[model samples]
Target: PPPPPKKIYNYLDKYVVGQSFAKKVLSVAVYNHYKRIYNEKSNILLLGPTGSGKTLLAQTLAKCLDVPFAICDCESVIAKLLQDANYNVEKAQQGIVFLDQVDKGVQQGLLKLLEGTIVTVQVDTTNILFVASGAFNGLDRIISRRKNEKYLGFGARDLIEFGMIPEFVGRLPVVVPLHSLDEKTLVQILTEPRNAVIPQYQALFSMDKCELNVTEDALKAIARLALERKTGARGLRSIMEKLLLEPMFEVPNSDIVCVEVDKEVVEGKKEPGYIRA
Candidate 1:
């Protein structure tokens, strides 16, 4: 068997591509949370930007730990459960309840849920973990206005304070922040061991007896453009589609095809052209 950390990462790496620091922090936090369960404690918060994979991490951890997991829509809770607080606690403690897009929900609703007692539906359950996540975009603005102070970029503490009530925030003892993925990290995402981009392209090329070569300069240019978009791995995926998909389709039906891309190719110096299929 793999080491505990490696085992956790190995499972996560299959679907999640980057955010190593977040993974490390979350793995330990999750492990510790469960460890505490054996010692009688529960609850954690997964804090990060949208598309930063907080929900994915939570789901992966639940599966790896072989625990029942339930995702609670924070919006639904506010819209429905606020009127009936009993149903909220009744459903929350059955297992791990993941409150997704939590920042979008009403703060008061969260306060009620967190402040209320853990109700027993059929049995006394104290080990259920409530994990919440959201893109706390306007947090910094709110904080700066309230304090009448200069606003720097968003920070974890600032986001937490903005999104959750003081009492509610205190209930979630562990907070893990998932960082934004960079261009280098994006490259790794495409070329990682399980989901290598080269093989994917190679497989497509194999259909027409063609070979694809992404030169160092081309890779750098693509990476630079991806970073400029600030979309992380998603941006790289878009770049890949623009650079490879359209060009490949433009090639006439041919037995042999070669996709050789460098800086010039990306710059449009080399027009998209192809020989007979």
Candidate 2:
């Protein structure tokens, strides 16, 4: 038993490198939701941006809490139940229902389910926790349309007000917004233990008997370029591929060699080469 894989952000830390604030908030919310099971309450909501790991966090939480997790996609529960009228609530007890990309699809039918109805089950069961998340990209447009004016500084509550129906918003008492990953954060993402991008490239280099070296300045430059591209940490992957792989493959039967990525290398002053194969 290797310490149970550290269910805290340490587990999340492996996959998602940065966004400490998002990790902290999600960890607390998940732990508290599990804690609430003892007292019998089950419902939560996670709101965030694209690629911010909202879906990953929910899935990881379910695994850590040892709860069965099922995704409720763009469909309402009532619609599902109507299609299969004999649906069993017992099967879902002690499990989590994750409604992903839920904001746009929410309607009166979904609101009724969130209001906590006495669902009949063929087998006896206690409760089921529901968690929902959405990007809500249309919120700004909706708000702008309603106010007949336009301005920034739109907070979480404002977005909730405009994006989600009042009843649905009220049902989800807990709301968390995930921030975009910055350059330093993106670098951490690229170098983190489990999902480190650098190690993968190193493995590729190893096939040609070459070593891949990354300098701090090089990492910074890469991070800056990624930020300029406005693609967050994901942009780094493309930059890394272009800078490291494109040229390496052009060499003919390149032998084992070590390539260092320093300030000069990134600035295009030094050319990377391979020795005898």
Candidate 3:
């Protein structure tokens, strides 16, 4: 059996940072994804701005489950659906289906799936957790105009108002809205994730018999500049590329064992200082 929500949340914490609210939602959703066979399956619909790690969260959840995973398309859903029709099973057994850009995940004829039908296909949907994600254009406006939420966010009204039919909205009870990454959160993203940019740079220098050190000011500068671009965490790499290329290409030519990257280097004010091995 899978561990509880907190354990799953902690596992997600190691690789994803700063989205405290989204994390808990994903935690509970995944916990229920695995443990509940008798109840109706709960699929998650993650909505957010670009580069907000919506798909990343779903992938992390799948990783935490440690199940036999793959980049299966709608086929996975069909496979389980077929299983239901072929043979009757007591317990639910199906891996997660992460359908990217499922604007109409309830695509034609899904009323049967979500209509109090755990597996209307005689399928094993109870075990499978489906997460559909996409940036529904104009969805923000719909949420705001609706009377329920005080301002722009996610909900069924937002869905129907945004152009999706009510039938589709009914299938997805839980609607999660991800906030855009701000400077504080962006900075946290720089070094918090298991494969944070700093660590990757450190390892790159290590390969040339050198250690890499980056100062706090450099990180802040990078985060600030990246935020300015409004590309969210995805912009971090482009910014790092600018700071990294100078040292990255030149350091190998010199016998530098350690490189100190400070604010100057990050701002293109200076180059990486090579420390003797």
Candidate 4:
């Protein structure tokens, strides 16, 4: 009866790309988050390698929520909750906590939040939507240990993934396991959103009367390199920024009217072609 998950998914599609698994899980979680029966919350665990849309997905989810919102990073969950508790009651009554790279301390703090002696509190986290987002750092062995084999997948187990209390991990639902971004999707990352990187770069050059055109080959090449790094779409920036830096900086000072990023430029065999004044 509240915000439909489809509506949230549709809205997210306008901005995010190549993260279908993450999108679906978030859609359902966000929908349930608002439909709090009394003091209910969504126990969400978002898992993926670095740059796999963990934070961005959280950002997108925030847009669909009509309630108050807050973020927590580099701090204990209890501290953040108590910190947010200082706000108006209704505002804190129901909100979202986007947890990043959950640490031993954060997980311990979350344990109390999830279940425990919080018989008294300034806020009722029961209505809060807790999102656990983390990078695939040093957990390859853990991942394989659980999967028990190569390319095998593991469902939500317990808080043991945090390397602490093994009993509490699966208390939350994690749908981010199969959410790796593909190369084709990387192309969309470049050109899809109204705020896509290509448009932003173009706008920067527009000030200097230069048209920045990234060719098909160049774009695909960038995607390939990003995939190689396993950082997914966000990896595209490292390669592209370096590839275009010299041209972007010089063309503005020069009379270059058009700069073309082509396959050769991306391959590093040659520089981009430009039309000089």
Candidate 5:
């Protein structure tokens, strides 16, 4: 049996950095997605900026649940779910489908499926959970104007105004909005998570018999770069990798026992400090 909403949220908290409100909303929605078999299903819609952990939340939720998961276009989701469930339509009905980029556009056929009325020879969309996510760029502006304050998500009318059709937006009754990650959250993401960026790099260096030490300011510098680039958390790894490339290459070849990354190293003003063995 799947865990309760709070338990599932605790699992998500270890992997997903921030977005507390979104996690709560998603946790309950997914819990309900499985808890109620005959009751009306409430599919989810995630609205957020790019690289703001929208897809991460969806994928992570699937991981915590013992359900068939697939990321694809709306039309093929059932087919893929059936395959993932080994052609068992019953198992497929309890699966989760992540439909990304729905804000960009969606096929007309998707509305019927979202309504949970679409029936195929192989499967029915009634019980399968649909979690749709999109950057929803410029949606905040529309929502803000309506509320007369900066907001992320509100109602289906605003989503309809933003571009999504009324029928499609209405089907995803559980709307959750993920906040853009800030510097502090990004810094914590670097070192605090179970699978953090810095810790992974440290493990890599350890494999080569080298210890990696990154200063607090250096972590801030990397986060600053990611923020400036407007790439959100996704840019953090790329920036970190680029910064460490030279040391990573030189460490194994040389007898470097320790590598120190300071602010200067992150800013590219100087190379990382190395202690020769």
Candidate 6:
């Protein structure tokens, strides 16, 4: 019993910030797959750079549907699928497989699995939801030749040229692209989602009897740096770890009750402000 696409998107919204297009595409594809309305497999091809939540999207959909989920390299999807299903044939058929870094894998062998197949112990992959994701690093240039946009809008020809076998690209009919996170979206990632970066740090501080305060400008500064460094949303933790390292180390050993971070602090122009208990 898969939830409706709207409900799926709603759940995804709580955990994933931005990439509305990818969210909708994945939700609908998964709903249709489980509903069996298409009678045709609609495996997904997620195109995006690192930290755009490719793996997260697949993992979240599996959770929403209460299905067994496994993440593995393109070559090892079958084994991972069987493992996640606990070697139960019926469960394996209904499970979801997230094939990460697909662009780097020589994918000719996946065509059979995508179309449908009985791999060992009667585990049929026909009903399994296959989500293949990759950074596809330079495919944007290939896409730009036909369309003048910076974002990806790929076709079979482009993917074939990008080193994916034509048959492999053919089976993944629903193609969705995730955007590079802008500073505005990155800031939201830092503070808005259920498992937001800033709150995660705040929770850690709270455990040690310290309150953390990060100003709006400081949030923006971190976002800007993430964007500038091209690490997307994933860089926020790295930057925060360094920014808060000294405070995290000293707070538990001192009388500090509040630790404040400002724009200058984020830029390393000023140290964090500490309030005495």
Per-residue accuracy of model 2 over 1-277 as CA lDDT, tens digit each: 1122235777777666665676776666666766665652346666656666777777666555544556665633533433343244443455566787876544676665566554333322235566778877666566567768655696845665765677777765566667776876877777775656788888877776677778788888888787777556558778887888655775426454776677777778887643444
Any idea what lDDT model 2 has?
0.64
Residue 264's lDDT within candidate 1 is 82
**Number of clashing residue pairs, candidate 2:** 1
Clashing pairs in 2: 209-256
Pick out the ten consecutive residues of candidate 1 with the lowest summed lDDT: 77-86
Q: Give a tens-digit lDDT track for model 5, residues 47-120.
A: 88887788777778777767687876326556766755645667777778888777873445677778776554
Local accuracy by lDDT, each model? 0.62, 0.64, 0.69, 0.68, 0.79, 0.79
Q: Write down the TM-score of every candidate.
A: 0.72, 0.75, 0.79, 0.83, 0.88, 0.89
Give each prediction's root-mean-square deviation over alpha carbons: 6.5, 5.9, 5.5, 4.5, 4.4, 4.4
lDDT (10s digit) by residue, model 3, range 39-122: 445677778777888777777876765553332333345464345432433333455566656563445455554443554545
lDDT of 6 at 247: 94
Query: Which tens-of-lDDT digit does each residue in 1-277 have in candidate 1?
Result: 2136656877787767777776776666566655655542345566656645677677676676544566665534322323343344434343566777766645665554444343313323355566677766676577676778665998945655685667666766666667776666656666664545656766777676776777677777777787777566567677777778765775436554776777888887886544344
Worst 10 residues of 5 by lDDT: 72-81
Who is ahead in lDDT, 2 or 5?
5
Model 3 clash pairs?
Answer: 84-122, 210-257
> For candidate 4, what is the TM-score?
0.83
Give candidate 3 regions above 4 Å deviation: 33-35, 66-93, 104-106, 110-127, 145-155, 275-277
Give the range where candidate 4 is weakest over 10 consecutive residues by summed lDDT.
115-124
